[PDB]
Paper text:
AdoMetDC is a pyruvoyl-dependent enzyme that catalyzes formation of decarboxylated AdoMet, a substrate required for biosynthesis of the polyamine spermidine from putrescine. The AdoMetDC pyruvoyl group plays a key role in the catalytic mechanism and derives from an autocatalytic processing reaction that cleaves the peptide backbone into β- and α-chains. Trypanosomatid AdoMetDC undergoes this cleavage, while the corresponding pseudoenzyme, which we call ‘prozyme’, lacks key residues and is not processed to the active form.
Crystals (space group P21) from both conditions diffracted to 2.4 Å. They are associated in a tetrameric structure formed partially through a domain swap involving prozyme β-strands (β0’), but which buries a relatively small surface area. The TbAdoMetDC/prozyme complex was previously shown to be a dimer in solution by analytical ultracentrifugation, thus the tetramer is unlikely to be relevant to its catalytic function. In prozyme, the electron density is consistent with a bound putrescine (Put’); however, in TbAdoMetDC the corresponding electron density is larger and the crystallization buffer bis-tris propane (B3P) was modeled into the site. The TbAdoMetDC/prozyme dimer interface contains an extensive buried surface area (3,200 Å2). Firstly, in the TbAdoMetDC/prozyme heterodimer, the autoinhibitory residues (S27-G30) have been displaced from the active site, which relieves the autoinhibition and positions F28 to form the catalytically competent ligand-binding site. This movement is facilitated by cis-to-trans isomerization of P31.
Numbering used by the authors:
A (entry chain B): 86 to 357
B (entry chain A): 5 to 23, 27 to 85
C (entry chain F): 3 to 24, 33 to 207, 219 to 238, 243 to 286, 291 to 324
Write the structure that this text describes.
């Protein structure tokens, strides 16, 4: 995958072995032409399921760190969660000379072991862009609920399997990518929607995939709706009470840069 | 390799069974400042030609495009 | 750099992974064991504890015996043993991971069940420094720890390129409602980098409760306590430590156990917050951490 270009930022999401960092020089150039100034860069990825197959600087977190340091020497890396299990790698750089107002929001989900009755619909012997055939898939699987009629959307059904969808409404976006293969089943979800509580959003995605385990990370800005709620003892939608079929295995909280926080939680299905 | 990536690999091996595609994604985000002389449209002033060259740098390509008064959305494939 | 695909086997164990696929820039290592049941203070002898530490290149030099506390002072490490836990803190030149398995075997020979364990190291540099052996040691530490506790996991709290703590945690605590194993521990750690103008001390006012202070080489001081009274006024004792030592950087770790006795103090005197964070373990307990630098 996904690329989101906004008035003030770029968001590039890639999977597989795409060497994502090779496009940084061109993004810096895209900001210079319009006479902008880079002030905030983040690179993030859930721990790779097969790190030995990654290429370029992505074969090791040290090399991702080395690469990003060559371009942003002040940036800082982090690792949230168990290093030999579900965790996130983050590299953050900022040159904020003008104290601004941060009211953005970012919600990401990584889901493994997807529902087998659902994977049947993420298969296809022919390529299919956004058309009547993918509409059937959205209704048959439940994506119609996550991406209702108020959203502009374009999606792609892959061959032999695979599915991607983008959705935009106003300044909000929403994306999903699915790897249906049983032995390496995975699905991702990300959105920037403003919401005092993410419980219904998350549950809507869980009902589609009902995964054996999933992680959720939440970036909280100080001046956002969720930020005001979080910084006053309010619940934000990732608390264990909202997921009774799941057990929280580890949770992290970090103020990676002043005033900005990140929450991450790993959930595993109890499997009675 | 480094000790931390060594730990990460052992966790991926224990959950690995040859019977594989990388689902977990990489995310890059760049936010820019706005100076007096900045284009009033920001990065949206660029046409799709600009962003297509970006995707070529990573050996990928656009498949479909949807725009908006606020966002440009592109779906990509290897 | 050229790179090709080598179709190689998967290591059957962590040890094979370290040797086949894989100057210490730390400042202290810490190894802790807790037991499913309180252990008699005198069943594990000083002789047996000293032999375990000989596997880590340490020789016993002094030992005292107080109410509920046995203290063993080595060349570069300090060992405390109460009915509830064994804790050893050592300098970085001590291969403290080589005492993990022998220590566990010692417990096994005494019918002592270890249900919780941790290995911790405070780093000033990064493990990604290829000119330092820091990464090869951490790999070995992970080999013994994961070998001994396959269910344990490592974590890294704080910026990987700044002051931070890398620790391994194994949680085998029985939490069945019928279990009498309670979790109301107090653990407060203060690491003070570059203090102004060497020793290993222990002080205790109650039984089984202690304060330990280590000072050694760049100078640094390491303070720890498990006294329940300390968890009621942490903001006071840290300020007393900063005045006494006056460091450039500080790293605090505070344990909030399942039965909470606790967020890090938001502000410290003449210090700015570099990083703040917390690790909420599934068992219900939390490890809070914050790093500071002189303003």
């Amino acid at each position: 995958x996904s690329l989101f270009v906004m008035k003030d930022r770029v968001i590039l999401i890639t999977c597989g072995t795409i060497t994502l960092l090779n496009c940084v020089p061109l993004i810096c150039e895209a900001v210079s032409t319009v006479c902008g100034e880079v002030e905030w860069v983040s690179f993030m990825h859930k721990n790779y399921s097969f790190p030995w197959e990654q290429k370029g600087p992505h074969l090791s977190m040290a090399e991702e760190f080395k690469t990003l340091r060559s371009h942003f020497p002040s940036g800082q890396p982090f690792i949230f969660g168990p290093i030999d299990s579900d965790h996130y790698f983050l590299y953050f750089h900022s040159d904020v000379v003008q104290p601004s107002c941060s009211d953005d929001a970012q919600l990401s989900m990584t889901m493994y072991g997807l529902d087998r009755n659902q994977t049947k619909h993420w298969y296809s012997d022919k390529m299919l862009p956004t058309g009547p055939e993918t509409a059937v898939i959205r209704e048959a699987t439940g994506l119609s609920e996550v991406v209702d009629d108020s959203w502009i959307l374009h999606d792609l059904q892959y061959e032999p399997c695979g599915y991607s969808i983008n959705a935009i409404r106003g300044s909000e976006y929403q994306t999903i990518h699915i790897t249906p293969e049983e032995h390496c089943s995975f699905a991702s979800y990300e959105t920037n929607t403003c919401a005092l509580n993410y419980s219904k959003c998350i549950c809507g995605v869980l009902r589609v995939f009902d995964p054996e385990r999933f992680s959720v990370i939440v970036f909280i800005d100080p001046d956002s709706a969720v930020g005001k709620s979080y910084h006053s003892g309010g619940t934000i939608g990732v608390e264990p009470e909202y997921y009774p079929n799941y057990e929280a295995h580890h949770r992290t909280v970090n103020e990676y840069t002043p005033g900005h926080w990140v929450l991450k939680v790993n959930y595993v299905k109890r499997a009675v | 390799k480094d000790s931390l990536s060594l730990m990460a690999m052992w966790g991926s091996i224990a959950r690995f069974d040859p019977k594989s595609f990388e689902g977990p994604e990489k995310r890059l985000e760049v936010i820019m400042r706005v100076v007096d002389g900045t284009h009033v449209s920001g990065l949206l002033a660029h046409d799709d030609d600009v962003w297509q060259k970006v995707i070529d740098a990573i050996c990928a390509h656009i498949v479909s495009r949807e725009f908006n008064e606020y966002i440009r959305s592109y779906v990509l494939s290897e | 750099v050229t790179r090709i695909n080598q179709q190689t086997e998967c290591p059957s164990s962590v040890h094979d992974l370290v040797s086949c696929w894989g100057t210490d820039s730390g400042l202290e290592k810490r190894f802790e064991l807790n037991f499913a049941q309180p252990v008699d203070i005198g069943t594990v002898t000083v002789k047996q504890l000293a032999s375990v530490m000989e596997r880590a290149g340490e020789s016993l030099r002094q030992n005292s015996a107080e109410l509920g506390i046995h203290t063993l002072k080595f060349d570069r490490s300090l060992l405390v043993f109460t009915a509830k836990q064994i804790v050893v803190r050592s300098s970085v030149s001590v291969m403290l991971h080589e005492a993990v398995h022998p220590m566990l075997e010692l417990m096994r020979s005494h019918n002592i069940i270890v249900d919780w364990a941790s290995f911790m190291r405070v780093n000033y540099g990064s493990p990604w420094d290829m000119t330092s052996e820091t990464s090869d040691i951490m790999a070995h530490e992970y080999a013994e720890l994961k070998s001994a506790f396959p269910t344990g996991h490592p974590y890294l709290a704080g910026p990987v390129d700044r002051d931070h703590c890398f620790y391994f945690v194994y949680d085998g605590i029985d939490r069945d409602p019928s279990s009498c194993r309670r979790e109301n521990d107090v653990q407060i750690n203060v690491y003070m980098y570059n203090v102004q103008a060497e020793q290993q001390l222990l002080v205790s006012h109650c039984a089984g409760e202690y304060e330990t202070l280590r000072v050694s080489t760049h100078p640094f001081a390491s303070f720890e306590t498990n006294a329940v009274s300390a968890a009621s006024d942490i903001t006071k004792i840290v300020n007393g430590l900063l005045k006494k030592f006056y460091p450039e950087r500080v790293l605090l770790v505070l344990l909030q156990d399942r039965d909470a006795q606790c967020g890090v103090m938001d502000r410290l005197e003449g210090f700015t917050v570099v990083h703040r964070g917390a690790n909420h373990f599934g068992g219900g307990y939390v490890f809070h951490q914050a790093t500071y630098a002189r303003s």
